[model samples]
Target: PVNQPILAAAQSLHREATKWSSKGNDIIAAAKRMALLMAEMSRLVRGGSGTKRALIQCAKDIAKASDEVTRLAKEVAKQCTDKRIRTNLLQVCERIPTISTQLKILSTVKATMLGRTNISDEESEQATEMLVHNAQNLMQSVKETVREAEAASIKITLRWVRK
Candidate 1:
């Protein structure tokens, strides 16, 4: 039998994560376009600044954000005993897998600088650049979600962890 309180908490985070995911997706998508814009800009504009920057610093920043939310969420999740919560909560946390892979590629590029990877130097850079900024947006969103998720979770002391 799952704990009602823990299940309730997970459900709360899941609800919040679902909402946040939609908003986060939009934010990340915009950042990605910005990354592409700079790429195109550097290719054509010939401006003094050149491609400018997408500014994603480290891939860890991204996963860290997700991990924090998940950790906080999972911590909260343990409050409840329902197995059903896993899938929903997991889905909410799953946002970064695509980016995680990209970040790894980015990390390799940063480390090797040989610019060789399964992906092209340019391709990898695009993904990496997108991740750095996307994380920034996500971090803010995470900060925002944490408060709300906390508030929501606190209200119920509940759980369910899915997706």
Candidate 2:
């Protein structure tokens, strides 16, 4: 099961991203949240066989979402007037691919672990540790990226107001 905190954080990020005037930024933020959610879902599946299947499906979905977000980020960078905001958004977009790749790897690991007739105690323990580590890393990235985006948005807003 997805942790409540992760879900809540993703939702909050989505809400904030929706408010961005730049459509590209908005799409990128949405994709970031989707990737985070998928990572969380993958972590949850590490606990059981049923969840392994679900994680695989979610991972594929996240990969697709991340690709779309990356495209939007590039589009925004080419058009947005605020250099800092554009750079920050592009950086965040770059991070998404890494997380999405990790999620895909986690999905495969979960599938293998689930298929084994008798997973050794050590193997099971290691799988959980790896999944948790991947999930936490992805979550942290999502949090930091969102924070950067929020700060960039505020800076842009202030700049416009000043002018």
Best by lDDT: 2
Model 2 misplacement above 4 A: 1-29, 32-47, 114-117, 140-163
For 1-163, candidate 1 gives per-residue lDDT tens digits of 3223323333333344443333433322333332333233223212222222322223444344455455555555455345445444444445534544454455444344443445575865564455345434443344343444434454342333322
User: Please, what is the TM-score per model?
Assistant: 0.36, 0.63
How well is each residue in 1-163 modelled by candidate 2, as lDDT tens digits?
Answer: 5445445545555554444443435554554557466546645653465566666777677667666655644564555567877787777768877876886887678667656487788887676567556655655555455555455555431111210
Whole-model lDDT values for every prediction: 0.40, 0.59
What's the lDDT for residue 52 in model 1?
26
User: After best superposition, candidate 1 residue 26: deviation in angstroms?
Assistant: 27
- Model 1 root-mean-square deviation: 13.7
